[PDB]
Symmetry: C2
Subunit: 234 residues, 2 copies
């Protein structure tokens, strides 16, 4: 088979839309049975302070020198494209903050086999839900418990800043080495990079090309165990 790695941040509307687009493409791919999907941490703003939560629309108009009209229109468009993938998406009063701790908790999840459940919870918590996922540990606890995780434990991870920090940074490091400066970023078989919330069409194409072009392995050759037992040479 082959592996598809997907770098994303929770505070990234196209990561949320692009995940659904990819999954839709994957479900129509002829070798979906041979594909493993691995989610990977990325922070769009790793330097941001935990207590720095801002309204999205303020951020667009203030931080990006864009009009309020234009800000609203981008969000309306994102709401339309989210609906079209079967995702809820609030087009008003969204907020934005640091995701570092969310990512540490995603690694707790990845190591409780619940990675995709907590990822979807956090996305839902962010984009579908009026309550903030930022600077609110009890919110993360509730979202995490809802995803199957244990609470005393999720709390221990949140209480201990070093808990899973290495793992978050290592994912971020790997993305930086692979050339990604923006998410979502999809790496198909460590041969092809796909960037942004592409049409399921492109994703389908990317899967097929990536699959199609894997050459058999190149061997280097000694003692082994095989259908007729183990070696005894020296």
């Amino acid at each position: 088979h082959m592996r598809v790695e997907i770098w994303s941040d929770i505070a990234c509307p196209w990561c949320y839309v692009g995940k659904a687009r990819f999954e839709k493409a994957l479900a129509a791919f002829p070798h979906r049975d041979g594909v493993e999907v691995v989610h990977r941490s990325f922070e769009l703003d790793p330097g941001r302070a935990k207590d720095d939560v801002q309204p999205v629309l303020t951020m667009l108009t203030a931080k990006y020198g864009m009009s309020q009209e234009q800000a609203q229109a981008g969000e309306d468009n994102l709401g339309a494209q989210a609906a079209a993938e079967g995702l809820a998406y609030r087009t008003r009063d969204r907020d934005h903050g640091s995701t570092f701790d969310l990512h540490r908790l995603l690694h707790l999840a990845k190591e409780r086999g619940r990675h995709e459940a907590l990822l979807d919870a956090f996305y839902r918590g962010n984009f579908a839900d009026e309550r903030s996922v930022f600077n609110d540990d009890e919110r993360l606890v509730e979202l995490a418990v809802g995803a199957g995780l244990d609470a005393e434990e999720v709390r221990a991870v949140l209480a201990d800043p070093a808990a899973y920090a290495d793992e978050v940074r290592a994912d971020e490091r790997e993305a930086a080495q692979l050339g990604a400066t923006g998410v979502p970023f999809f790496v198909l078989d460590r041969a092809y990079g796909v960037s942004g919330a592409q049409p399921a069409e492109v994703f389908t194409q990317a899967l097929t090309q990536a699959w199609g072009e894997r050459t058999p392995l190149k061997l280097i050759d000694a003692e082994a165990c095989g259908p007729d037992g183990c070696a005894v040479p020296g």
Copy 2:
């Protein structure tokens, strides 16, 4: 970086010796910091019955039409090569059996971040230890608890045959697709296959070649979030 996947069985003396040889090679590799090692299930005898435990030396002489002298000599040699890697290895009275349940428990471990600890425990339980790891659930419980895992839980996995069965078969399936018919089998970056307990020299070589020859990714190209925010095109 890059990933190195290692297929092995617990009832495989060269898997045990080859793991140590690889690790030794990895520790002297200039880009060890960029390598992720993932362990993968393989059963040399998946059809074997849980209650079918045999002395190794009987198996060699009876099942492989080899002399008893020769059987003992292979084991003595394996004991020497194990010592040379810092591994204990009993050259007498080893037994051999089904590993299916061990592999299911390794997947429990992989999903408690304790994969390498339980792998080394099971190897030690098999090759260093006079007590059998085969057809003895309480032994597996003890070995598993010693490796950091929870007991009521390890027992639930052992009580439920379907627990992690899919995961074991999927690893075995992948090995079969990659052409492996014997272990240990090392796949470096999905580009190079290395088979058997090779000299750390070859492993070093394999790492270097595999690392050296990764070409940058090929991209296919849309909306993303990046250093200057998120897209708004349509």
